[PDB]
Amino acid sequence: ITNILTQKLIDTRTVLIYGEINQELAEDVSKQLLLLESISNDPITIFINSQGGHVEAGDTIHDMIKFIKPTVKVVGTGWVASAGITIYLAAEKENRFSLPNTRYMIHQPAGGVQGQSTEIEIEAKEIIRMRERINRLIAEATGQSYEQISKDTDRNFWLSVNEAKDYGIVNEIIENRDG
């Protein structure tokens, strides 16, 4: 009877990304996505409630979503911020949904360095590049120009569910499964 039970979980083709984005979470999601892919090519639904976290962990989840054969649909819930947005934006525009009570936030990446000028300088060049890479990724998936994203992510750019729709992040706001 745990036969018909975890079979039921796996039949939903549903992955939950709730909380801080880190390498552990990236490992769980990767496993689940790879597992679901080998079962069938049917679509996968991802519910995202994330404030963000580790950008490289976000990159992995983003790239894995595009990597697997099955079409991935995303549903934003609660909030989707920073690295969370990167993950969210991995899905094709037609497949980017949001529940009504969700807010969205994009910003430039943050970090820290201590040491010699040379060390600081090296890490500065690196975070500038990262800022550019993420901004281009956002621009591309969203329809906005690179310079628009670049200007908006200067500070914390909060968007209500409706503004996220207008901005090109969210495609369709849904309340029901359609049922």
Active site amino acids:
82, 107
Sites of contact with another protein (CB under 8 A):
107-118, 120-121, 123-124, 127-128, 130-131, 154
Residue nearer to another protein on the CB measure, 46 or 106 = 106
Q: Which of 110, 113, 154 is nearest to 135 (CA)?
A: 154
Burial 65-99 (b: 16+ CB within 10 A, else e): beebebebbbbbbebbbbbbbbbbbbbeeebbbbe
Angstrom distance (rounded) from CA 58 to CA 80? 12
Site string for a copy of itself, 122-161 (x = CB under 8 A): xx-xx--xx--x---x-----------------xx-x-x-
Backbone angles phi, psi at 76, to 5 degrees: -75, 130
* Beta carbon of residue 85, minimum distance to a copy of itself (angstroms, whole number): 13
148 Rama sector, left if φ>0, alpha if ψ -120 to 50, beta otherwise: alpha
Q: In this structure, are residues 61 and 32 in contact, taking their beta carbons and an 8 Å threshold? A: no
* Contact positions with a copy of itself (CB under 8 A) in 68-97: 68-69, 77-79
Q: Which residues bind a copy of itself (CB under 8 A)?
A: 1-12, 14, 16, 18-19, 23-24, 26-27, 30-31, 34-35, 38-39, 47, 49, 51, 56-57, 59-60, 62-64, 66-69, 77-79, 99-103, 118-119, 122-123, 125-126, 129-130, 133, 137, 155-156, 158, 160, 174-177, 179
